[PDB]
Design a protein around this ligand. Structure first.
Ligand SMILES: *[C@@H]1O[C@H](CO)[C@@H](O[C@@H]2O[C@H](CO)[C@@H](O[C@H]3O[C@H](CO)[C@@H](O)[C@H](O)[C@@H]3O)[C@H](O)[C@H]2NC(C)=O)[C@H](O)[C@H]1NC(C)=O
Ligand code: NAG
Lengths: 277, 280, 132
């Protein structure tokens, strides 16, 4: 009844914080979490792991899963790679920690693709999302995307590399992928600030995170197309080790709770925005 | 074995000609629509003489099943569901155990081995039918004609039912299961058992005839008919978002194959091309 | 938009909002664990009295001030330079509270109830809060 859970920081779903110094721990709604510390990175036993408080949407849903299926869990943040990629045929991140079994399950901004699926068993997706483009204030058939390196002043747009979106683009748009590798970005908010003055024209990434951006945006900059026009409809789901027994239980519990409608309230309290409409 | 229900946004069913073949009907792009011969009763069984007349059938679900069949290289047989209803466990008359009907029952009996339809995933089905990953995303909404814009699932006029406002859903359907689970909504469920319809066509016409006031159903279906039929509008947000996922029998090996197939179809957007072929 | 605005549903640094520390609404926000984040904002801007926060809002130092209804609509009807918003989401009562042991509990209860059926506080409202 205990599992290994690991994630990294993706703002609206993952929030890391230092524990309250005046209390030692912190307020409720948060769970203890720690650095990814291996045998070499154990950093001694005087401070075996720096306690941190991790709270968020995924934290709440995993809390409900634990309280339903009656299982415990230990949480540690991930350092080696963001989430996972077949780097030289070797996976990293949560994908590496699960496939090579330093981890039991995974939760977070885990986009489900085909490759991850044959690599890692997934659950039913608890939320829907996919590809979207956001620009300061038109479709994957537009010359702005079809051949942005042929006419006009070169159109300056990009994304973050080593991601599922990058995998799909490289697998469908290798010429445009070669164009985009010129425009890679350190972080989502980094490119956001870049386009706030106009370093890059538009950003291509998850629809959900851009919804969270624009919903709280003070400038109210909207995505390339109303309603996002989400391409390659996918979601976020629980990642299980290959043919793990937990699959049936977690799927049944997750779908039952999704039908109960409280997930609507959790998304209302977590990812809602101000000027989204 | 292919089983389904005639659903205009996803399943088009027409009578074959006297010669027993499908019409050479081509798309606006000039390519013919890929149509098969699905057998089954000529009209609904109570009103029908129970003649299992084969009829031409084609559409979105048909297109995707053809694609995935070409991917897995297997033949098939197409035949719609006998009762015309989705189905659920029910302590039927003179019985004790809650028993499925519809295509779930037809599969558990073995009449069909896998379902191809815009079926909704619910936990109740999850215990008995293996759902793969969703192939489409959709939601639940309300439809009216053409002034008291209905307040989604938050209007008291729904919460305290009135004889001036008549509304219902389809029996033995996913929305029935949903309204049955939320006991707080039970009163509207009590309204349901008054006027529940049996198929989309009659309910749509009755709303167009104002026999009904508002109909709760899939987002995709309502937006499709609105973009094609007009004169009627959906209202309120998608109070319950979910997926249409291709379901199939428990523990049969093909689940992983079809799952990765629909994943790679989402990778190249082939399903998006299907939608553009079917939703303009 | 009352209480259900993501401006307040999601705590925002650009927007300032607070109350009086060591007050009932402090306990309200403390028990509402899901609202603890806004309680985190409370820790930065909590005032000590009403008048200085009122001046700050009139000086626009404070964007919004949450507090009890009666006093607030009284101030709104008197000064008219500030506007109230949000419904009385927390129904409550102003009552004479005192020690459990003393016998005046029931006596004072019945006396104030007799005044209520007599509309004595209605006359008091006409005297102090109404006609403004
Ligand atoms: C897809 O369905 C398949 C059949 O139900 C099955 O994967 C299949 O597994 C066989 C067995 O390895 C593969 O056959 C290859 O390997 C054998 C043994 O080495 C050879 O004798 C064959 O000639 C062939 O080279 C199939 O190729 C494989 N099918 C696929 C599509 O990869 C799984 O149920 C599903 N697997 C996948 C990957 O979708
Ligand atoms: C055709 O189908 C058979 C059986 O389903 C399979 O063994 C064979 O590999 C398929 N051929 C192709 C080209 O897919």
């Amino acid at each position: 009844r205990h599992l290994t859970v690991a994630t990294l920081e993706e703002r609206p779903f993952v929030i890391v914080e230092s524990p309250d110094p005046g209390t030692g721990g912190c307020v409720p709604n948060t769970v203890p979490c720690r650095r990814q510390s291996n045998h070499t990175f154990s950093s001694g036993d005087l401070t075996p792991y720096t306690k941190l408080c991790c709270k968020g949407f995924c934290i709440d849903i995993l809390k409900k899963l634990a309280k339903v299926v009656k299982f415990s869990y230990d949480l540690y943040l991930v350092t080696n790679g963001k989430h996972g990629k077949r780097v030289r045929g070797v996976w990293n991140g949560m994908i590496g920690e699960v496939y090579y079994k330093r981890a039991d399950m995974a939760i977070g901004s885990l986009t489900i693709n085909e490759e991850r699926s044959e690599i890692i068993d997934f659950s039913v997706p608890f939320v829907e999302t996919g590809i979207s483009v956001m620009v300061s204030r038109s479709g994957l058939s537009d010359k702005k995307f079809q051949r942005p390196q042929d006419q006009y002043p070169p159109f300056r747009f990009g994304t973050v590399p080593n991601g599922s979106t990058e995998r799909n683009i490289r697998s469908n748009y290798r010429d445009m992928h070669t164009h985009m590798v010129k425009f890679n970005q350190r972080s989502v908010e980094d490119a956001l600030t870049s386009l706030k003055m106009g370093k890059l024209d538009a950003f291509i990434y998850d629809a959900a995170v851009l919804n969270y951006m624009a919903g709280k945006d003070e400038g109210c900059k909207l995505v390339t197309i109303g309603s996002g026009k989400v391409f390659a409809t996918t979601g976020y789901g629980i990642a299980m080790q290959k043919d793990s027994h937990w699959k049936r239980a977690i799927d049944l519990a997750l779908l039952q709770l999704l039908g109960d409608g409280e997930t609507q309230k959790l998304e209302t309290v977590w990812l809602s925005g101000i000027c989204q409409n | 074995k292919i089983v389904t229900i005639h659903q205009e946004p996803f399943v088009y069913v027409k009578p074959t000609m006297s010669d027993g073949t499908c019409k050479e009907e081509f798309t606006v792009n000039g390519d013919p629509v890929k149509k098969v011969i699905c057998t089954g009763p000529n009209d609904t069984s109570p009103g029908s003489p129970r003649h299992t007349v084969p009829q031409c059938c084609y559409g979105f679900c048909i297109d995707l099943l053809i694609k995935l069949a070409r991917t897995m290289n297997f033949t098939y047989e197409v035949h719609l569901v006998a009762d015309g209803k989705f189905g659920t466990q029910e302590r039927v008359n003179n019985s004790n155990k809650k028993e499925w009907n519809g295509m779930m029952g037809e599969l558990l009996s073995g009449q069909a081995d896998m379902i191809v339809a815009p079926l909704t995933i619910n936990n109740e089905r999850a215990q008995y039918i293996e759902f793969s990953k969703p192939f489409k995303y959709q939601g639940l909404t309300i439809l009216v004609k053409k002034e008291e814009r209905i307040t989604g699932i938050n209007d008291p006029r729904l919460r305290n039912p009135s004889d001036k406002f008549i509304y219902a859903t389809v029996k033995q359907s996913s929305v029935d299961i949903y309204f049955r689970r939320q006991v707080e909504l039970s009163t509207m469920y009590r309204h349901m058992e008054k006027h529940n319809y049996e198929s989309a066509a009659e309910a749509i016409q009755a709303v167009r005839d104002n026999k009904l006031h508002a109909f709760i159903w899939d987002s995709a279906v309502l937006e499709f008919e609105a973009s094609q039929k007009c004169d009627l509008v959906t209202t309120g947000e998608l109070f319950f978002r979910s997926g249409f996922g291709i379901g199939m029998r428990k523990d049969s090996p093909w689940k992983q194959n079809v799952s990765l197939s629909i994943l790679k179809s989402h990778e190249n957007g082939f399903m998006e091309d299907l939608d553009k072929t079917w939703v303009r | 938009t009352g209480i259900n605005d993501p401006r307040l549903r999601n705590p925002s640094d650009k927007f300032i909002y607070a109350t009086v520390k060591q007050s009932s609404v402090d306990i309200y926000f403390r028990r509402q664990v899901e609202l603890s984040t806004m309680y985190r904002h409370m820790e930065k801007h909590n005032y000590e009295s009403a008048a200085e926060a009122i001046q700050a809002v009139r000086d626009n130092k404070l964007h919004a001030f949450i507090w009890d209804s009666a006093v607030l609509e009284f101030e709104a009807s008197q000064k008219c330079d500030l506007v109230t918003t949000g419904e009385l989401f927390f129904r409550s009562g102003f009552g004479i509270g005192m020690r459990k042991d003393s016998p005046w509990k029931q006596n004072v209860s019945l006396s104030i109830l007799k005044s209520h059926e007599n509309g004595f506080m209605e006359d008091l409202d006409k005297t102090w809060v109404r006609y403004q």
